[PDB]
Amino acid sequence: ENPMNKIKIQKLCLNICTGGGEILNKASKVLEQLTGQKPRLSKSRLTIRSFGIRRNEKIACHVTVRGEKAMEILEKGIKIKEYELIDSNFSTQGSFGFGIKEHIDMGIKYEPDVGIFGMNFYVVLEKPGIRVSKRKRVKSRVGNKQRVTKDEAKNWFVKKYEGIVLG
Amino acid sequence: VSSHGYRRQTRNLFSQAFRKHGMPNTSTYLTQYAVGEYVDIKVNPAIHKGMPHKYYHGRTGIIKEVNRGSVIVLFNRILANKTVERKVIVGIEHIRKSKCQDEYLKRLEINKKIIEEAEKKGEVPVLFKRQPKGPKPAVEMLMNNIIELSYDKVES
C-alpha cells in the first residue's frame, strides 16, 4: 500500500459542564488526574435565567489531548460504551463523538466529597499534510484527496476496535 | 439650514471608488518631489493626517517648500472681488505629479537646439510655433464606385 495516505488521531476533546460555584474546582481536579494537564475554564456566551446562567460566568472546563495519551483514553472509554455506536454519531467531516454518565468507570477512586460527574468525548481524525492550512507563511486549502470521509471514519473504527456500528 | 464644519457636504467627495478601498501603493511613497514642480491634489480618505480643505481637491499648484513627509503649495483664490494668494500644507499621500506642462517641455527641447544655430548661421530663430487647424484640403477623386442615397426607410 501507499505510505502517507493513512489515518491517525489528531485530537481528543474532553469537556464537563457544571454551572455554579465550588463544583468547578471539584470538577477540574478530575480532568487534572485523567490527563497530565491543567484544564481551561470557559464562560457563558449569553444570559439564560431558566438554566441558572448569568453572562460571563464560568460554566465548564475542557482539555485537549494529543499523541500517545490519546490512545489510552479512547480505548478506556469505548469499553464503557461496550463498543456500540450509532450511524448518527459520525459527521460529514471524519469525526465522531459519544458520552459517559459516570466518571468512576475510568477507574479513579471515589472520595465521597468530590462527587459524580459525566463527560463528553469528541475525536478528530486526519491524514498527513494538514499543516498547509495552519502554518503562517503560504497558507492554503487542502486537496480533496487528503480529507477523511464518513465511510472511512467508520471503516477505521471497525478495523481498530472490532466494534459494531448500528444503523 | 446648513452647518459649517471643516468637512461639511463631503459625502460624495472623500469616499473610495468601487473595488478600490485600502491603503496606498508603494509608488506613492517612493516618488521624490522638488521645489518648482507642478503638482495636483487628490485626497485619499483613508489617511487622516495632512488632509487639505475640500476647496483644494482636484486643483493644481506649484511647490514652494519641501519637508519630511509634507509639501507647501501656492494657490490663488477670489475673495471680496480681489485676488489672494494662499499657502496650503499637504501630506505626500494626497498628491500626484501634474501632467499640465508636458507638451511645453517637449517644445522647449526643440527650441533649445534651434536657438543655438540661430547665433551661428541665421540671426533669429524660426521658433516652431503651433498653428490651429486650417481650411479643408483639396482632393482628386477617381469617380468609379458611386453610392446612391434615398429616403427608402419610411419610418412608420
Binding site: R137, K139 | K20, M23, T26, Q32, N67
Partner: protein, 281 residues
C-alpha cells in the same frame, strides 16, 4: 449562503498578489522603505534574512521605483566550498552566512581594508573610523518570522556586524541577556561555536544509543565527534575571512524549453466540443 449568489463574485475585491500568497506584509514594508523628502541621495539598504528547510539566505536589497535591486547575496549552501559538511540550517550556519554576505559587500565598495573583522567579543554597534570613509549602513528585514530571544535571524545579523556593516541593534534578543545584570557573553560565544549541539550529542549516548544513531546519522557518516566542533568552526570562520570563492559561469539552458506545454488552438477546441455533442446525442 454567501457563495450561492452571483453578486458575491461581482462585488469582490482581491488582495494584492503577494498577500494572497502570504509572502509579504505591506504595513511593515511601507514603514521600512518610505522615502524621506529632505534627505536627498539617501538610499537605504535592507538586509533580508530568510530561512528555508535546506538553507539560509542573506540578500542586500535597495528599493527602487519599478522593482527592488539586489546588490549582493550569500547562501549557506555555498559554505560547502570551505569544507562545511553538516547542519546547513544550524545557528552557526546562520552566523557564517551573515559574515560571508558582509565581506562580499565591503570588497565591492573597497572598504574591506579599513573595517577589519571581529569574531564575537562584544555587543556594541559598528562605529565610523575618523579621517576615513563612513561605514556601509543597513537595516534588518525579518519578514513574517517572529522576534524572540535566540531566533536564528538575529544570528545572521550579528554575523554582518562582526563582518563590518553598521546595523543598529539592542542586545535584548541574544542568549546571555539578563533583565537587570551585565551581559554574559560567554553564553553567546558558546552557541556561535556549537556548544549547544555538542551537549546534546553527549547526552544521547548515555541515554539511548539507538535514538542517537537515528538523530545524528549524517554526523556519524562524516566521523565528526562532539569534541571536534570548535576546531571545525574556527577554521570555517577564518577561511571565510581569508579566501574568495570562484566566479560563476553563464550557460544557456535554453534547450530545456522542450518540456513546456502549449495551450490548445481555437480550431481544436471547437472540434472537440462538436465531437462531444455527437458522442452524447
Amino acid at each position: 449562503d454567501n457563495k450561492s449568489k452571483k453578486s458575491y463574485f461581482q462585488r469582490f475585491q482581491t488582495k494584492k498578489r503577494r498577500r494572497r500568497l502570504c509572502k509579504t506584509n505591506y504595513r511593515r514594508r511601507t514603514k521600512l522603505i518610505k522615502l524621506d523628502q529632505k534627505n536627498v541621495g539617501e538610499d537605504k539598504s535592507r538586509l533580508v534574512v530568510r530561512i528555508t528547510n535546506s538553507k539560509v539566505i542573506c540578500q542586500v536589497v535597495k528599493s527602487h521605483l519599478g522593482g527592488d535591486m539586489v546588490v549582493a547575496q550569500a547562501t549557506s549552501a555555498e559554505l560547502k566550498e570551505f569544507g562545511l559538511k553538516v547542519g546547513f540550517t544550524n545557528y552557526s550556519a546562520a552566523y557564517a552566512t551573515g559574515l560571508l554576505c558582509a565581506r562580499k559587500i565591503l570588497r565591492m565598495e573597497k572598504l574591506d581594508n579599513i573595517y577589519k573583522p571581529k569574531f564575537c567579543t562584544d555587543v556594541d554597534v559598528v562605529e565610523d573610523i575618523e579621517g576615513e570613509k563612513n561605514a556601509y549602513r543597513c537595516y534588518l528585514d525579518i519578514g513574517l518570522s517572529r522576534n524572540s530571544k535566540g531566533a536564528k535571524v538575529f544570528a545572521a545579523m550579528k554575523g554582518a556586524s562582526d563582518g563590518g556593516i553598521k546595523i543598529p541593534y539592542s542586545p535584548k534578543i541574544f542568549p546571555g541577556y539578563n533583565k537587570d545584570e551585565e551581559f554574559d557573553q560567554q553564553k553567546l560565544r558558546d552557541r556561535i561555536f556549537g556548544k549547544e549541539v555538542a551537549n546534546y550529542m553527549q547526552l544521547l549516548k548515555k541515554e539511548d544509543e539507538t535514538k542517537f544513531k537515528k538523530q545524528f546519522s549524517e554526523y556519524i557518516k562524516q566521523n565528526i565527534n562532539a569534541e571536534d566542533l570548535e576546531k571545525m568552526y574556527e577554521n570555517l570562520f577564518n577561511s571565510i575571512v581569508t579566501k574568495e570563492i570562484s566566479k560563476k559561469e553563464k550557460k544557456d539552458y535554453s534547450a530545456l524549453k522542450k518540456y513546456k506545454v502549449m495551450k490548445l488552438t481555437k480550431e481544436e477546441r471547437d472540434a472537440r466540443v462538436q465531437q462531444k455533442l455527437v458522442e452524447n446525442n
